[PDB]
Structures are given as structure tokens and as C-alpha cells.
Amino acid sequence: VSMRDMLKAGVHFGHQTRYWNPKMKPFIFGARNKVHIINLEKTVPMFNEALAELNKIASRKGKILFVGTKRAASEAVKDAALSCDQFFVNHRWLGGMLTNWKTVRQSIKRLKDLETQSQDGTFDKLTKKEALMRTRELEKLENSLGGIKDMGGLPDALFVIDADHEHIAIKEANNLGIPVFAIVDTNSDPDGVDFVIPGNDDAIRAVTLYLGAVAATVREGRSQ
């Protein structure tokens, strides 16, 4: 990929130079149009870090939780993880998935009872104010938790986009020791992020590049 794919995508974009969280300062190259520019000259060796990292994590077959919430990259994440059969949260991060897993696990086990009902296990009973109430109950659960329903226990690696936009998950992960892989733009602060991936986040031309190149490397730590 290198600068070649990084630019035909736009990894070099960074917010306005009037929003930039100063902790990014090593990673920037300039300010074209009152807007920052991310090296793609440090990124490429540093993006390579996480690549050869998730190899190691998927080598023990550990669980990799993808995270993305923006409508822009909401659909990138869901299709990228299921391309690897790993877990993902493409909607709002239900505040407490990790630190409060002893409670969120109840949420999954109740939808896993529910979906058996809603398809075959004796759904069509009376009080049709009851039938739809499940349909909206199941949909709401599946829409925000259906990403990671089969997951079991806690993950071992966590890949996010917009460390800023998703800073709850980072604050949950860092409080559980789980390593955190992020993409942090000029408006974010990687001080929680273990393995940073400096460069433009919000995208699909650029995000399916981060995911599509990551999505593979998980498999070849999994195909082994």
C-alpha cells in the first residue's frame, strides 16, 4: 500500500489547523489550506506495526473487537469483521461493554433467547401488542449488540477508529489492560492508545483500506 494507496485514498488528510490536538505534533508534515497533513512517511512504518501485530494476536486465535460508529465507517466495520468472523460494534458503543461485561452479558443472553423465539420457538402467540414489542426489542438489541453476540468472554485486541469519537471504549479497554489499536487524526490524543495508526479516519475509500488490509492480516494469523 505505502504512500501509493495511502494517497489515492486520502490518509493525508487532517482537520483544520485550528482544531488540532497538539499531541499529534510529531505526526504532522505541514498545514496546507489551514488544514494539517499527516506524514504517510512515518505512518507507513508505524501502520506496519499494527499489521504485524494482529498477526500475533490472531495467532493465539484471540478475539478481535472492531469498533466504528460514524455513519461514514459504520458499514465498513460490520462487513470487514464478518469477512474474518471476528466481532464488531458498528453502532453506538453501549457504554460499559468491557468494564461492565458481567452485566452486558445479560443483554446478549436475553436476545439469544429472544431470536430463537422470534423465528421458530413459539412466537406467534396472542396480544399482538406483545408480538411487535419483541420485534422492536430484538431489533434494538441486534442493532447495537448483534455485532458481538457470539463473543463469549472479553476480547484480547481492540481496533477502533476516531479515538476521540470512541474514547469510551478506549477508556474501557485501557481500564482492562486489553491492548488498543486505533487510528488517531489531528483532533485526537493517542495517550490512551497502545498502538497508534496516525492518519485520516472518517472515510470508506481510506477506511476500507485500513480495514481491508487489516482484515486480511487477521486471517493469516488465523489460517496460520
Binding site: 494517497l7 488528510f13 481510506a206
Partner: protein, 172 residues
């Protein structure tokens, strides 16, 4: 890396708010998804592409941009495509069309205490004071009219002062 100087060359292609390629790689009758410009995927409303005038000629693959209204308002390139690519009648404000030779479409609605006239096929300017039109007569032309001629007559703050003239008089 002057290897990104061939991408500093890609910087040239189109960079400030101006005509840009305008890749419509994604499409939907909800939010026409523009992609080219500066930032990645966009979020523009629709006024000449879908669900707007009824013209469905932006079929996935059309390459029109939106004059990059914002270089980057934060992961947001341009916005509504009112008249951004083919601003054949106005551009900056009106002083510079593109030919000014052939009679371009013009409309002369008088001053109903202001004007509020779609004088040009692309803008709607409010005019200050007398000489609202060319001057055969000032406040006696409230019909949209048809394609007669088009000239300049009296600009002011050079923002929404688009001044059109079409009576075929002595052209004052």
C-alpha cells in the same frame, strides 16, 4: 517525500474551492454521495442530481463536483449543488459570466419593496435603489418575461447584487 510531490502534483489537479472532478461512486435518493474534491466520502443535499428537479442523469459514475464549497469543514468537503459546476450565468457574483455575447436567460421582476427576483437562471438577487433594471422604466416590469438580452446595470456589495438587464432599449 517528493514522491508525494507527484501527489503535490495531485494537489494541483483541483485544490481550492473551484471546479473539481466530483466522483459519484455512491448514489441513493436520500443523500447523493459525492466523493472527489479533497476529503473522503461527503454528505451533500440534492438540487440537480436526484429527487430535486426530476432529472435522473447523475447515474452512479457521473463526475460533477460542487465547487468545493468547503476545502474541509471537518470531514466535510462541499454541500448543496445549487449551481456549482455549470454556473454559466454567474460564478463570483455576475460581473463575469463566461461569454456575455449570446443572450443568456434573463428575468425582470420589479421592486416589490425589494425585488426578490430570480433575475438569473442560477441566482436571485435583491437590488438596491433606482435603476433596478436597465432604464427604460424602473418600477414597471414585474413579469418573469422571456429570453430577450442580458447586461450589467448597477452592482453594490458584490455578494447577492447580481444585476441583469433585458428590455432591448438603448441599453443604458
Amino acid at each position: 517525500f517528493a514522491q508525494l510531490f507527484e501527489e503535490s502534483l495531485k494537489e494541483i489537479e483541483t485544490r481550492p474551492g473551484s471546479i473539481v472532478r466530483g466522483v459519484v461512486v455512491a448514489i441513493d435518493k436520500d443523500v447523493v454521495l459525492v466523493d472527489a474534491g479533497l476529503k473522503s466520502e461527503s454528505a451533500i443535499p440534492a438540487e440537480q442530481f436526484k429527487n430535486a428537479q426530476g432529472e435522473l442523469e447523475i447515474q452512479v459514475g457521473d463526475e460533477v463536483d460542487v465547487a468545493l464549497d468547503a476545502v474541509e469543514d471537518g470531514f466535510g468537503e462541499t454541500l448543496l449543488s445549487r449551481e456549482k459546476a455549470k454556473r454559466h450565468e454567474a460564478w463570483i457574483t455576475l460581473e463575469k459570466a463566461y461569454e456575455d455575447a449570446e443572450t443568456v436567460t434573463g428575468v425582470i421582476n420589479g421592486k416589490v419593496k425589494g425585488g426578490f427576483t430570480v433575475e438569473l437562471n442560477g441566482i436571485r438577487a435583491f437590488l438596491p435603489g433606482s435603476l433596478v433594471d436597465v432604464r427604460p422604466v424602473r418600477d414597471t416590469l414585474h413579469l418573469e418575461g422571456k429570453e430577450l438580452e442580458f447586461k450589467v446595470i448597477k452592482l453594490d456589495q458584490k455578494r447577492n447584487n447580481v444585476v441583469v438587464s433585458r428590455r432591448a432599449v438603448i441599453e443604458s
